Amino acid sequence: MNIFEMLRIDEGLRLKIYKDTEGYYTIGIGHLLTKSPSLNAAKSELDKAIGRNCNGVITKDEAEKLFNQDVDAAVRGILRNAKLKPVYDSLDAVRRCALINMVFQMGETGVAGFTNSLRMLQQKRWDEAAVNLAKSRWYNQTPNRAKRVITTFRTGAWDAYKNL
C-alpha cells in the first residue's frame, strides 16, 4: 500500500463532474473544481485544468494526471508549511501517509488548525492523538474515512485499508 492507493480508496474515481460530500463540484480522484454553485463555473475550471474542451467529462488518464499533481502539491505544501513540516519530519513512513491524506482532503490550512493533535502526534502519543482527532467536524461529517485515517495514525500500519 502507498499514498496513491490509499487516496484512491478514500476518494474513488469519477469521470464526470460530480458533487463533494460537501456539495462541491469535483472530478476524477477528489479533484475539487470550484466551491461555486454553477455547473458552468465548474465546467470552465475543468477545461482550464485539462487544456481542452471537456464538456464535463475526462478520461482515466486525465484523472490520474490531476491526481499526480494533487499529491505532489499536497506533499510540497506540507514541506513548505511551518506548522506541518516539523510533524511530517518526525513521523514514520506509514503515518506520513495519514498526514498527507488529511492535507489532500482538507487543505494545508485546515490541517494546520488541528494544533493540539499535531502536538500529540509529534510527541508520539498515538492513542491520545486519535481521541483528540475524533473531536472534529471532520470526523462527524465523514466518519468512515476519518476513522481509517485515525487508525492509521494510531497503529502505524495499513490494516484499516486491508479490509477495503
**Catalytic residue, candidates 11, 45, 62, 108:** 11
Ligand-binding annotation for 32, yes or no, is: yes
According to the annotation, is 4 in a ligand binding site? no
Is 89 assigned a catalytic role? no
3-state SS record for 77-144: HHHHCCCCHHHHHHCCHHHHHHHHHHHHHHHHHHHHCCHHHHHHHHCCCHHHHHHHHCCCHHHHHCHH
Confirm if 96 and 86 have CB atoms less than 8 A apart.
no
Q: Which of 5, 10, 20, 108 is catalytic?
A: 20
Reply yes or no on whether 61 is catalytic. no
- Judge whether 103 and 68 are in contact, CB under 8 Å: no
- Show the cell assigned to 67: 491526481
Q: Given the C-alpha cell 476519518, which residue does it identify? A: 146
- 132 carries a ligand binding annotation: yes
d(Cα 153, Cα 134) in Å, to the nearest integer?
Answer: 12
CA distance 162 to 164: 5
Whether residue 104 is annotated as binding a ligand: the answer is yes
Counting Cβ atoms within 10 Å, is residue 164 exposed (0-12), middle (13-18) or buried (19+)?
A: exposed
Task: Please state the residue numbers annotated as binding site.
Answer: 32, 104, 117, 132
Q: Which active-site residues does the annotation give?
A: 11, 20
Task: Please state the residue numbers annotated as binding site for substrate.
Answer: 32, 104, 117, 132
